[PDB]
Coordinates of C-alpha atoms in Angstrom, one line a residue:
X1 CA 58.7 74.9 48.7
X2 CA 59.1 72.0 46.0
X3 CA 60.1 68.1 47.2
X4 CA 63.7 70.0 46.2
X5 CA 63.5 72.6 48.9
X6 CA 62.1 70.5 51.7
X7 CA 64.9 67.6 51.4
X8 CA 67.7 70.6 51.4
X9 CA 66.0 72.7 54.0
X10 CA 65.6 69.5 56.5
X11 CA 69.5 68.4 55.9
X12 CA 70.0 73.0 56.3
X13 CA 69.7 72.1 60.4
X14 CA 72.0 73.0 62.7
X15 CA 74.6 70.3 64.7
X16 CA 73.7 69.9 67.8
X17 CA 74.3 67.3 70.5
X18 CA 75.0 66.5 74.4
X19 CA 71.4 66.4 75.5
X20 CA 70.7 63.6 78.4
X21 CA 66.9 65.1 78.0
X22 CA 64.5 65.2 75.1
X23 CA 63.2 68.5 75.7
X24 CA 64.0 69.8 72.2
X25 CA 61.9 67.4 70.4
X26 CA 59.2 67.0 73.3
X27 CA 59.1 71.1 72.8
X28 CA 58.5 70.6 69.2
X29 CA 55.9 67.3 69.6
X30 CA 53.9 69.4 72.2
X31 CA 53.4 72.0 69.3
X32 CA 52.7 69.0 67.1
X33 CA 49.6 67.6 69.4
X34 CA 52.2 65.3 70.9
X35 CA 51.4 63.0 68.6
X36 CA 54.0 60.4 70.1
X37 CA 51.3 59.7 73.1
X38 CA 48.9 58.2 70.8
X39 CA 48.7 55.1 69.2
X40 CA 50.8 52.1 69.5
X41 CA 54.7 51.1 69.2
X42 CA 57.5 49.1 68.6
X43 CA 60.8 49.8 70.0
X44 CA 64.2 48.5 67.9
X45 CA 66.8 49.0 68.7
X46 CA 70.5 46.7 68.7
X47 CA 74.6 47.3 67.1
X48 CA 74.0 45.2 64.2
X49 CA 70.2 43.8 63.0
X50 CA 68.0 45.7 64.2
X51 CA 67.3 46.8 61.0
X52 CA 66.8 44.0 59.6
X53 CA 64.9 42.4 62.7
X54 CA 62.7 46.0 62.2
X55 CA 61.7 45.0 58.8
X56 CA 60.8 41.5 59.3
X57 CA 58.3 42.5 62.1
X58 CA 56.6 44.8 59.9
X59 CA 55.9 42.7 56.6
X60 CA 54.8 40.0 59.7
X61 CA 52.0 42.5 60.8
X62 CA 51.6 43.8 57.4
X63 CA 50.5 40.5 56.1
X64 CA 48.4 39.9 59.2
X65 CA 46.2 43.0 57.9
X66 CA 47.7 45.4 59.8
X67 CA 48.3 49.2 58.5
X68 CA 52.5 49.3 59.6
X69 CA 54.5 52.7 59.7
X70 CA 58.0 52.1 59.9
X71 CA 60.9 54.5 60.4
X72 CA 64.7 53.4 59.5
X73 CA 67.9 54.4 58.4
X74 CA 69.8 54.7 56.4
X75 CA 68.1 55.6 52.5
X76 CA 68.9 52.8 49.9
X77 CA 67.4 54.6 46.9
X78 CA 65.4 57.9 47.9
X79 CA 65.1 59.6 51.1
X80 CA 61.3 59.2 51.5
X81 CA 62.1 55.7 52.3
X82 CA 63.3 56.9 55.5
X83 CA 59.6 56.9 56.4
X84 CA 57.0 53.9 55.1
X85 CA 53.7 53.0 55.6
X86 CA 52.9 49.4 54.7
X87 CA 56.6 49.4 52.8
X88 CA 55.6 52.0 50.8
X89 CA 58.0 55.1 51.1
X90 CA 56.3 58.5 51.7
X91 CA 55.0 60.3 48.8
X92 CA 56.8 63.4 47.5
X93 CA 53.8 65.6 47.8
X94 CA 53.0 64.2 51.2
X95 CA 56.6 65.2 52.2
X96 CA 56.3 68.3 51.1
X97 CA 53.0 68.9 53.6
X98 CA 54.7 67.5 56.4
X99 CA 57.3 69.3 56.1
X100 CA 55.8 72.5 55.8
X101 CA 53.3 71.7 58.6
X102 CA 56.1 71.0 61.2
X103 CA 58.0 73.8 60.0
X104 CA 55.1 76.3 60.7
X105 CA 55.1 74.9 64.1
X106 CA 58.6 75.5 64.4
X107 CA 58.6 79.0 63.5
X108 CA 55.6 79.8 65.8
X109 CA 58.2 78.5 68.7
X110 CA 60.6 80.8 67.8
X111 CA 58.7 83.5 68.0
X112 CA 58.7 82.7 71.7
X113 CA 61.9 81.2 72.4
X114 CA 64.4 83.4 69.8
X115 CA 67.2 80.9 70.2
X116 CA 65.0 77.3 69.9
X117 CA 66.0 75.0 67.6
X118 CA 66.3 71.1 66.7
X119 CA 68.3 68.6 64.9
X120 CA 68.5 67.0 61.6
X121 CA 67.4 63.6 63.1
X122 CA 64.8 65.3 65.4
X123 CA 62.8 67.0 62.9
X124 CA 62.3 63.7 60.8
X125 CA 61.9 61.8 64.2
X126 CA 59.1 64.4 65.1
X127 CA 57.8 64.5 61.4
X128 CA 57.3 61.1 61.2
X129 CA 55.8 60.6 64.3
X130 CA 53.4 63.0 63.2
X131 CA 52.7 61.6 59.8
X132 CA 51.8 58.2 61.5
X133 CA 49.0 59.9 63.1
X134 CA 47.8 62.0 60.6
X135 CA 47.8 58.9 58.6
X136 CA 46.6 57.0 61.5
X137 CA 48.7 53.6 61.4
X138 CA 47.9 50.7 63.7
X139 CA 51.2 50.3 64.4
X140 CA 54.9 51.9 63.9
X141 CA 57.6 50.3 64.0
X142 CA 60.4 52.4 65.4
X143 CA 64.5 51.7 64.3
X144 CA 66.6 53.5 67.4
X145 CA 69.0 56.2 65.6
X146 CA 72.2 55.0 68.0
X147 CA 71.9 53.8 71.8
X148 CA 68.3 54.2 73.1
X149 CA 68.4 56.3 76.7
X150 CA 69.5 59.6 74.7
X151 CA 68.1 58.4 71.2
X152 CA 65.5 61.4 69.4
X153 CA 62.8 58.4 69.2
X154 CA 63.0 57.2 72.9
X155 CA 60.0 59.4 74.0
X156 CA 57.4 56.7 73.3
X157 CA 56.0 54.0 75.3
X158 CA 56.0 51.0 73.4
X159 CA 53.9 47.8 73.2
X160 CA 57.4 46.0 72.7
X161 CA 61.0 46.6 73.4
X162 CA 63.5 44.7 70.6
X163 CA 66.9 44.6 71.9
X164 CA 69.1 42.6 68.7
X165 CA 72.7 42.9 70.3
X166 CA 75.1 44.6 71.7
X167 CA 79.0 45.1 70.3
X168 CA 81.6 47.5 70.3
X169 CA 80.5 49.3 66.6
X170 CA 79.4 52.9 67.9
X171 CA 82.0 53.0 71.2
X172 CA 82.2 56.5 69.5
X173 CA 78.8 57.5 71.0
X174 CA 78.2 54.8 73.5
X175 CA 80.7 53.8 76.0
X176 CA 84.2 52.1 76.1
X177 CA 82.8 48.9 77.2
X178 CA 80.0 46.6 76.8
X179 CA 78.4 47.4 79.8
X180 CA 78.2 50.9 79.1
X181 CA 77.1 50.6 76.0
X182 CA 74.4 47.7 77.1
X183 CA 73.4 50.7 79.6
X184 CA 72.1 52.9 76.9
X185 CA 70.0 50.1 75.1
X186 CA 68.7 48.9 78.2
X187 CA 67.0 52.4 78.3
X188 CA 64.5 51.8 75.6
X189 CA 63.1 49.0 78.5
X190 CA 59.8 50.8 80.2
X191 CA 57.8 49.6 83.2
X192 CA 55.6 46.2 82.3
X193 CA 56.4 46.2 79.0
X194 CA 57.8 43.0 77.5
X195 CA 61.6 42.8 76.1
X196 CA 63.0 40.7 73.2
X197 CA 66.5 40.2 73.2
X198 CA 69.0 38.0 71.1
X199 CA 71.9 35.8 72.9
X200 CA 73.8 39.0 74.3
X201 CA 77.2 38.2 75.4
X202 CA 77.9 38.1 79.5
X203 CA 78.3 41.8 80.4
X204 CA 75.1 42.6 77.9
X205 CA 72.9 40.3 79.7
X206 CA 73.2 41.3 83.1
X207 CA 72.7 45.1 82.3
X208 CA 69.4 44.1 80.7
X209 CA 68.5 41.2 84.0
X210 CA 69.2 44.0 86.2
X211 CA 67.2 46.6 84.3
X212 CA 64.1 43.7 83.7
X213 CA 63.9 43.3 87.7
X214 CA 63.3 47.4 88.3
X215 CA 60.7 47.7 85.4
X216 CA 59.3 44.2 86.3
X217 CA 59.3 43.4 82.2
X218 CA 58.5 40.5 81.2
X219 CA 62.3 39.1 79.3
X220 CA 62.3 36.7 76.0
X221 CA 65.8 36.1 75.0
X222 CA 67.4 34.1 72.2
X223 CA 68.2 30.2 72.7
X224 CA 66.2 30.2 75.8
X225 CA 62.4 31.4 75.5
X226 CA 62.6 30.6 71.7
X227 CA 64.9 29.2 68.7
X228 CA 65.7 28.2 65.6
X229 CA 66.5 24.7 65.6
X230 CA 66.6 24.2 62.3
X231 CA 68.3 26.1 59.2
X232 CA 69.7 26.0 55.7
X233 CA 70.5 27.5 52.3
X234 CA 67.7 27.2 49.9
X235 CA 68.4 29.1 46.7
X236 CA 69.0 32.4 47.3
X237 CA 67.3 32.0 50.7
X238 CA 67.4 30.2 54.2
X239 CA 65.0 27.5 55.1
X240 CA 64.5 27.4 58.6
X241 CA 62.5 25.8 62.0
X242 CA 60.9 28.3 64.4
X243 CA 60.6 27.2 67.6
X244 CA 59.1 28.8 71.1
X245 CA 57.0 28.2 73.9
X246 CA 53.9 27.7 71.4
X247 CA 55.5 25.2 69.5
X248 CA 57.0 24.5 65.9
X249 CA 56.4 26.8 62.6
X250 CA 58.5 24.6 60.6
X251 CA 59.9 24.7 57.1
X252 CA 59.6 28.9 57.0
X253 CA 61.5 30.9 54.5
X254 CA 62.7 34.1 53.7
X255 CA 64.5 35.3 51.1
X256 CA 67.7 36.3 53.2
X257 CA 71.2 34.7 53.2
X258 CA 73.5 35.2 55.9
X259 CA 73.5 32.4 59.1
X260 CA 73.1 35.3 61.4
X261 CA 69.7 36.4 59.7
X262 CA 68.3 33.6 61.2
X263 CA 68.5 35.2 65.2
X264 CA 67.2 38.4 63.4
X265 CA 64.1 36.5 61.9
X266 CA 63.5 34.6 65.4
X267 CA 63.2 38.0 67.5
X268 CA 61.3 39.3 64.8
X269 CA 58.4 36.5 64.5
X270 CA 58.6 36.0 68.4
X271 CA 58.4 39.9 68.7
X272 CA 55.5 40.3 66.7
X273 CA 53.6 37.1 68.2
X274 CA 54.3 39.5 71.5
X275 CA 52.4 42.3 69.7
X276 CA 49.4 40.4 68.5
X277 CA 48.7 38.7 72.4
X278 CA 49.9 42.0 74.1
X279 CA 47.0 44.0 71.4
X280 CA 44.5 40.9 71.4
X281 CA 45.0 40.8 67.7
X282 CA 45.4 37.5 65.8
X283 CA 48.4 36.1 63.6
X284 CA 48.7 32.9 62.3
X285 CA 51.8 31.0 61.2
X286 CA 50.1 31.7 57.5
X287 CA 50.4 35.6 58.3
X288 CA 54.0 34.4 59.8
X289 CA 55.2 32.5 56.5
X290 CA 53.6 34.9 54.0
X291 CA 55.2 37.8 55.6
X292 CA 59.0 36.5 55.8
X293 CA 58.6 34.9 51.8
X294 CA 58.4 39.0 51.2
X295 CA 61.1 40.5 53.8
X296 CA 63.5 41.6 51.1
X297 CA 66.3 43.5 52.5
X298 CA 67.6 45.5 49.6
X299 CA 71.8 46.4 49.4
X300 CA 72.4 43.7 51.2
X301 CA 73.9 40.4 49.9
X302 CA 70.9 41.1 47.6
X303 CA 71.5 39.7 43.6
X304 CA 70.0 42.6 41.2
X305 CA 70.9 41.0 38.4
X306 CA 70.8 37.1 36.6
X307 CA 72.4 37.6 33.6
X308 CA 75.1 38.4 33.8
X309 CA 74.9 37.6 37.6
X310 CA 75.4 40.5 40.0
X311 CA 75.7 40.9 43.7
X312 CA 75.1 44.3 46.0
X313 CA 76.0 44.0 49.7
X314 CA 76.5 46.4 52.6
X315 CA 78.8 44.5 54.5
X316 CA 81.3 47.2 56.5
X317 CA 83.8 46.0 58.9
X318 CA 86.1 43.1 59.2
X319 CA 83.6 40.8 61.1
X320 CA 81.0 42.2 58.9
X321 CA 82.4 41.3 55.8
X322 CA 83.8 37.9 57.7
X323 CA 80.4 36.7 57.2
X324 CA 80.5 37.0 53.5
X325 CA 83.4 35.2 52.6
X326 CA 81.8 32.4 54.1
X327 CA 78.5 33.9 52.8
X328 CA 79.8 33.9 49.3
X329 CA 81.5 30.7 50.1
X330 CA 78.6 28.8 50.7
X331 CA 76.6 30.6 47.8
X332 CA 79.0 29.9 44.8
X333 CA 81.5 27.2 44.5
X334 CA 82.8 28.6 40.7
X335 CA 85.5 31.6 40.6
X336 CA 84.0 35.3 41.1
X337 CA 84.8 38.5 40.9
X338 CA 84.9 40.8 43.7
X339 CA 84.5 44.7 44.2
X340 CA 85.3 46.1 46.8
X341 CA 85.6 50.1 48.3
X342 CA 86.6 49.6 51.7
X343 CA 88.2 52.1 54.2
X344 CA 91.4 48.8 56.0
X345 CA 94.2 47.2 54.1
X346 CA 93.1 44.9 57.2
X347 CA 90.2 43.5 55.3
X348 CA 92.1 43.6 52.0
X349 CA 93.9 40.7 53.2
X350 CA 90.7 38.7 54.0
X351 CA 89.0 39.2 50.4
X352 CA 92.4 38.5 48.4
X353 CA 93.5 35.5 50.1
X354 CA 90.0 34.0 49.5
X355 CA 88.6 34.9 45.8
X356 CA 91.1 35.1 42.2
X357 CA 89.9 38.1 41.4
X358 CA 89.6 41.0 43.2
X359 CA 89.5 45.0 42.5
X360 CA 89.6 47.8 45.0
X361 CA 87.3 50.9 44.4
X362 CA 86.8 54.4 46.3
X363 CA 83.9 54.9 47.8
X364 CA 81.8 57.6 46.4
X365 CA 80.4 60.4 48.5
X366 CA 83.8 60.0 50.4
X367 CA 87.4 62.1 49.7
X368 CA 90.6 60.3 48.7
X369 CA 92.9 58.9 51.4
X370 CA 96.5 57.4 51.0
X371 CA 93.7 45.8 42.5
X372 CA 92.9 49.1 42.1
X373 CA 90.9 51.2 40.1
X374 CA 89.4 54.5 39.8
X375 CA 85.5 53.7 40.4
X376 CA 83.3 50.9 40.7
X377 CA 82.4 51.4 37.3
X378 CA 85.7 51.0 35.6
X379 CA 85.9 48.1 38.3
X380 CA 82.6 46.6 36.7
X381 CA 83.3 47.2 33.1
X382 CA 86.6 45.5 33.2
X383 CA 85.5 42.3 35.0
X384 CA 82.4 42.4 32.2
X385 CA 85.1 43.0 29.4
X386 CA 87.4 39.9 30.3
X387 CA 85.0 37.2 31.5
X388 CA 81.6 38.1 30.8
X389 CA 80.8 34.9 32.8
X390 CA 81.8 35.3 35.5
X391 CA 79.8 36.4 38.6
X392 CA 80.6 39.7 40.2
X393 CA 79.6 40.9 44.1
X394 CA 80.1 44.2 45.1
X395 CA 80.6 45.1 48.4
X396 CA 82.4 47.3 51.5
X397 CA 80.3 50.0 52.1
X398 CA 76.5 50.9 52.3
X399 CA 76.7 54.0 50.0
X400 CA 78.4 51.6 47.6
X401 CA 76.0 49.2 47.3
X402 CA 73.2 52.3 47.5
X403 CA 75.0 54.0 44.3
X404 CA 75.3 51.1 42.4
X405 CA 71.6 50.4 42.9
X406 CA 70.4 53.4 42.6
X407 CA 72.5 53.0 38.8
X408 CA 71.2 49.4 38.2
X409 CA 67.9 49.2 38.9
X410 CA 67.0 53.2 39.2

């Protein structure tokens, strides 16, 4: 098969689901050499930032002079980004090996068990967990797909356990309530292994207290083992204090905007100065500062273009895009031009009464459902037609941002 054929025959798997085990994927591993048992981890998992909190731990080690796998969702640009060694998403050739070794693998299983079979998410799980090894990483850093307990990925024992937050997003998946939903994250928590947690809200915190005292783990949370005193805009950026039981790294910066960012960068630095002392391996507040100046988190609130001045951002739901309005706020005080696909009238409220111009978009990859225009495009050329000037953001949805990226810059 051709790069092509591989990407079509992974997405070809079957839907499957309701499995409180792993014995699918630890089926498949075994034939893989169970690669999962070797070498060493990091957990992530949280509702909103752990992708973000993922990211900033790896450029952290990365610039330490560590070799850092890292497996996330969703794709920006292509799907080898999915899977990244050092930032660097996996080659098309190299995909193409992979995929053909674990397939072989696969079809030797059949052979035995006629009606065996996996999922989408845990063939690239298993895949990538394989590829690490092959390619021998120090370190990979691993992004939960939803929950933990149940999650493809949680058949590792990792080095350390990020826990962002905990909200009510997926109560599709999770639970009806914070607890329950607290209960799957919580599961990702082994037996000695250290936790790191943001501020979780009441019923959050006492699932993961509870858990902590059975697996005897040692617990860092947010605004009480370490914090960011300090923070503030600069440029197109945040210039913040990091502060923990070691001390002050003052005057750090990352090229991020969003006051929430800030928790996200805090679990990540403390995280990783949990790796380094769990692993006997030094980083310094150099290795620290170099590797945030280079966490760029692409799609989101991310400006691909000066002149004229655009804007890409994945914000979703009504809280999520609560913190751009103020984002934006805070960002440009002169009149823009906002795009925005989302999917409802709820938020449409929240973007009109708050910028003069404002158009609404469908977002592609997704039917029609019952300010407007027909695409992003028309949306763009319009707003570049009347006043050339002015800035534009687009935002509302992931894929949005993704296909106008993809259209930009690709």
């Amino acid at each position: 098969m051709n790069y092509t054929e591989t990407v079509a025959y992974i997405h070809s798997f079957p839907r499957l689901a309701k499995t409180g085990d792993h014995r699918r994927i630890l089926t498949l591993l075994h034939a893989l050499g169970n690669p999962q048992q070797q070498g060493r981890y990091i957990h992530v998992t949280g509702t909103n930032g752990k992708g973000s909190a993922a990211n900033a731990i790896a450029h952290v080690l990365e610039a330490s002079g560590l070799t850092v796998g890292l497996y996330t969702s969703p794709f920006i640009m292509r799907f080898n980004e999915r899977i990244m060694i050092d930032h660097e998403p996996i080659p098309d050739a190299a995909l193409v090996n992979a995929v053909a070794f674990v397939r072989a693998a696969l079809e030797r299983l059949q052979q035995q068990q006629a009606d065996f079979n996996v999922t989408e998410f845990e063939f690239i799980t298993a895949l990538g967990y394989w590829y690490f090894r092959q390619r021998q990483v120090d370190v990979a850093v691993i992004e939960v797909g939803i929950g933990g307990d149940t999650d493809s990925t949680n058949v590792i024992t990792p080095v350390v356990s990020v826990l962002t937050e905990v909200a009510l997003d997926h109560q599709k998946l999770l639970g009806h309530t914070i607890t329950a939903i607290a209960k799957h994250k919580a599961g990702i928590i082994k037996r000695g292994i250290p936790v790191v947690t943001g501020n979780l809200v009441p019923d959050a915190a006492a699932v993961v207290a509870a858990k902590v005292a059975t697996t005897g783990s040692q617990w860092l949370r947010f605004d009480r083992d370490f914090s960011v005193p300090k923070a503030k805009l600069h440029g197109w950026g945040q210039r913040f204090t990091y502060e923990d039981q070691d001390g002050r790294i003052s005057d750090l910066e990352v090229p991020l905007v969003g006051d929430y960012q800030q928790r996200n960068m805090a679990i990540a630095i403390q995280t990783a100065k949990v790796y380094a002392k769990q692993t006997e391996w030094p980083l310094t507040p150099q290795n620290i500062r170099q590797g945030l100046a280079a966490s760029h988190w692409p799609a989101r609130l991310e400006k691909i273009s000066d002149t004229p001045l655009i804007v890409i951002d994945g914000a979703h739901n009504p809280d999520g895009i609560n913190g751009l309005i103020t984002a934006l706020k805070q960002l440009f005080s002169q009149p823009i031009t906002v795009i925005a696909g989302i999917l409802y009238a709820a938020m449409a409220d929240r973007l009109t009464a708050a910028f003069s111009t404002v158009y609404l978009v469908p977002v592609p990859g997704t039917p029609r459902a019952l300010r407007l225009k027909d695409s992003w495009q028309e949306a763009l050329a319009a707003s570049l037609n009347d006043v050339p000037d002015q800035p534009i953001v687009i935002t509302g949805s992931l894929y949005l941002a993704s296909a106008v990226r993809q259209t930009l810059l690709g």
